[PDB]
A paper describes a structure:
Cellular Src kinase (c-Src) is one of the most representative members of the Src-family kinases (SFKs), a group of non­receptor tyrosine kinases that mediate responses to extracellular stimuli, phosphorylating a broad range of downstream substrates. Although v-Src shares 95% sequence identity with c-Src, this kinase shows uncontrollable activity that is responsible for the occurrence of sarcoma in chickens. A number of these mutations are located in the SH3 domain, which plays a critical role in enzyme function by facilitating the interaction with partner proteins and providing the formation of the closed inactive conformation of the kinase. Here, the crystal structures of three SH3-domain mutants of v-Src were determined to unveil the effects of these oncogenic mutations in this regulatory domain.
Besides the v-Src SH3 domain bearing all of the mutations, we have cloned domains with (i) only the oncogenic mutations in the RT loop (v-Src SH3 N117D-V124L; c-Src SH3 R95W-T96I, based on the sequence of the non-oncogenic variant c-Src) and (ii) those in the n-Src and distal loop (v-Src SH3 W95R-I96T; c-Src SH3 D117N-L124V). The v-Src SH3 N117D-V124L crystals belonged to the trigonal space group P3221, with only one SH3 molecule in the asymmetric unit. The overall fold corresponds to the closed-monomer form of the SH3 domain. In this mutant, the n-Src loop conformation is similar to that found in chain A of c-Src SH3. Meanwhile, the distal loop conformation differs from that present in both chains of c-Src SH3. As expected, the most significant differences are found in the RT loop, in which the oncogenic mutations Arg95Trp and Thr96Ile are located. In c-Src SH3, the hydrogen bond in the type I β-turn occurs between Thr96 and Asp99 through their side-chain and backbone atoms, respectively. Nevertheless, in v-Src SH3 the substitution of threonine by isoleucine prevents hydrogen-bond formation by its side chain, and in this case the type I β-turn shows a hydrogen bond between the backbone atoms Ile96 O and Asp99 N. However, we could not obtain the intertwined dimer structure of v-Src SH3 bearing the oncogenic mutations in the RT loop, even with crystals obtained using the same crystallization conditions. Instead, we only obtained the monomeric form, and both mutants had only a single molecule in the asymmetric unit. The reason for the lack of intertwined dimers of these mutants can be found in the role played by Arg95 and Thr96 in the stabilization of the dimeric structure. Neither tryptophan nor isoleucine can form interactions to stabilize the intertwined dimer.
Author numbering: 83 to 140
Write the structure that this text describes.
């Protein structure tokens, strides 16, 4: 539906976060409410929380 792209690298020490590379495609699992979103990587297949301000619709 709506695909998002990472705007910056994100590496987290919280293992339930999704870490990702600038340019990687991600998707939202729930909705766009909140500053932290449950997300899924379209490249690694992993699911985890991400900061909303690190991604944009592509």
């Amino acid at each position: 539906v709506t695909t998002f792209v990472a705007l910056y690298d994100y590496e987290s020490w919280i293992e339930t976060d999704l870490s990702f590379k600038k340019g990687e495609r991600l998707q939202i699992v729930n909705n766009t409410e909140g500053d932290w979103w449950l997300a899924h990587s379209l490249t690694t297949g992993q699911t985890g929380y991400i900061p909303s301000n690190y991604v944009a619709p592509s």
